[PDB]
Symmetry: C5
Subunit: 204 residues, 5 copies
């Protein structure tokens, strides 16, 4: 495991092949989760921020930016979208949580809550995933799409097997995140494939 | 009755089915009223905020948002509309009052008064209503329209049988409303039908 | 006669009928005047604010709003127009002064001077007027136009027989006007016709 | 001469005749000059601010507003233009300097420097001008153009036979200009022709 | 060498001829560099900011502004572009760094980092350059294009043979740059060709 404190993944160009695999020892299906990270991109087209596929299941858990000010969450192929006022281009801190019992998905942008949406109530997101940054998966670990590639910088990424309350979301945004049990930036297991560079985080 | 202090109804999806029925013992026709509530939605299309129908009477009392920055009140099928500068998307506190003797409708958006309008002077809004949140009624308790459904969050809903002066509107906006005798968020009788989730209010 | 301190006229709907007559015993033709008032409307189309006609003379003294950010003054059928940056919709305090010796017309919007314009130097505005609020006169007391009708609220109307200095205009905008000899909101003689309601001034 | 301290020329209407003649006793060719003045106009079309012609020579020295946010200087018929962010309509302080040896023209808008441009390096602007405010000259003292006429207010006009440094430009903007040897608002020899009115400066 | 502290190069007109040659003792191929400078221009069309060509090689190192809010860097005819929110017209401080080992190019605009891009990883930018300000080269020292010419002002130009950390970039922006070993504004060897004028920097 690697300590990425004060560092980002830079995806410096559009491609079909540049990506990072994120490795997690997750064996049981998810009833709850929270995912937080920082992103800086000047793409205007759609792109994937976080792609999580399982065997035979596309878009099992996908965070997707359709256009400026619009964020989408996919859970088992189904999707919700919430909107926000945002400057472009601008660095952004994104948190998203989902809770099976209610189906409620909560997007938080720069520590500010978006309108709640709901999907897949009672569903469990499948385990044994392939998780990739920089590309959107259409297969278990591949079938990428250049028009959906992420060009820019991603840092401070955390994933918890719980729904973070607002205080913990703000803590993540303001730079003191709670240690995370699925993915943790201070102890990340990753594989760089193609043109991805690790650099200091300079836009915080 | 239920105390919903610090909580909202979440209408997490577009549907023709999801709604909340609000129960009030109202047996006498309304001459005066004030209605306040908090709403958070990222719909750009038109939607119903508060739908009050009686037997044989559509839009007997309706608060309707035609588009961004435009608020409509219907009294006995008749309509008035007032405009406001507002950001989108954004949480909003809406208060609307109507007085039969003058016919004056008073919209207040985030503690700021809109231009007064007037309709149905001398009219009495009928009793024995069915009151719905989440959908727009075209019949007594039903005939909903998907394209008019409310998607998002509503809380701090209060209804008085009198016209509130500005200081009382401001108090409600600030989160310390006067006790209300038709509908009271802190003592609410309601029925959830379909996909509506009660969650803590995190956007104030 | 009537003290309308803290009160306004509400013209709650569009019509060709609803108006307020402003009665004055003015016998001498005016050489100098200043007229101040408060207005709040969300009309986008053109409308008349202050209509002053005499026998056989249309548009003898008219304050006309052609569109957002543009104010017109008519003196003896002749026209001047000055422009201003303003939000819409927004309450506004309008002062306008005219002086025969120079012809100079000064518009003041919310205590800010507009570009001085000029018209009808040497001319005198005829006396024995019919002064109306809420409609545009095309005859001596009548002949109204629906598309020119004022929908909204008017208050703090004052009219002096002299040209007010910048310091005296700012006092009236600040809510402490000097007493006025032609029209005085703190001692006004008026006539309500049609659907016009007096209410408290809530938007200051 | 006349002390015009705290006063403006008001050009109250669009015309082909209303102008002010400015008379300088200098009677010498110009190698260096700085011209500062205050202007307030709500014209959207192009207009002349300062027109300086010599016998047989049109546009010898001309300050010309093309459109909002665009200021032109003509030296001996050659033209430079510089851009600025400005509100419309708004009162403005304009300073412009030109130095023969370098050809450099320096526009200053509200004490803020525009991008330097250069023209007519080594040229001498001709002696014995007819200087006009309110109209654009095409002949020696005349051949005015209605569509180029200045409508609005001009005050605080000063002209030096030197290039003013930033500190001196700022002093003029602030309202404490250095004594001027070509044209001076505190000792100005002027001729009013047509409809031009002297009024106090109120928009500063 | 000249200490150009507090001074700018002014390119006062559009031309195909006016330019400055920048002379450097660098004879070693560059692996790493940082370039910082200040620019003030009101051009809306594309223009070259810094043109660096070698024998037989066009656009070996080029800083190019295609349009408002878009900055392009060329390394060996390969291009990356980054976007920023900026006012127009407005003075700008530009820093750009490039690193061969990673290919990472970093734009900094007024001390704010843009999204990192990547190009020409492993490449060596060729030595013995002709460096021009005011025109874009298409040959070794020439072949200019009027439509790519720079009109406006440039100052505070520095170039280091290393990738500067954020602190040193900010110091340059704030007006305390570190000594620079390729090009240094405080000890610059230059050649003015055509119409270029040295003036004091007034827009800082
Ligand atoms: Ca997919
Ligand atoms: Ca895909
Ligand atoms: Ca209905
Ligand atoms: Ca309906
Ligand atoms: Ca009329
Ligand atoms: Ca009329
Ligand atoms: Ca001319
Ligand atoms: Ca002309
Ligand atoms: Ca080239
Ligand atoms: Ca070229």
């Amino acid at each position: 495991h690697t300590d990425l404190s004060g560092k980002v993944f830079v995806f410096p160009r559009e491609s079909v092949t540049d990506h990072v695999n994120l490795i997690t020892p997750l064996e049981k299906p998810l009833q709850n989760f929270t995912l937080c990270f920082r992103a800086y991109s000047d793409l205007s087209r759609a792109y994937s921020l976080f792609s999580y596929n399982t065997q035979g299941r596309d878009n099992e858990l996908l965070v997707y930016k359709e256009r400026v000010g619009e964020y989408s969450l996919y859970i088992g192929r189904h999707k919700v979208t919430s909107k926000v006022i945002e400057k472009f281009p601008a660095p952004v801190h994104i948190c998203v949580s989902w809770e099976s019992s209610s189906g409620i998905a909560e997007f938080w942008i720069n520590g500010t809550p978006l309108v709640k949406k709901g999907l897949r109530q009672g569903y469990f997101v499948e385990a044994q995933p392939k998780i990739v940054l920089g590309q959107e998966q259409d297969s278990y670990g591949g079938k990428f799409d250049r028009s959906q590639s992420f060009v820019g910088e991603i840092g401070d990424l955390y994933m918890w097997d719980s729904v973070l309350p607002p205080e913990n979301i703000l803590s993540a945004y303001q730079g003191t995140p709670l240690p995370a049990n699925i993915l943790d930036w201070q102890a990340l297991n990753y594989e760089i494939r193609g043109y991805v560079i690790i650099k200091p985080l300079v836009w915080v």
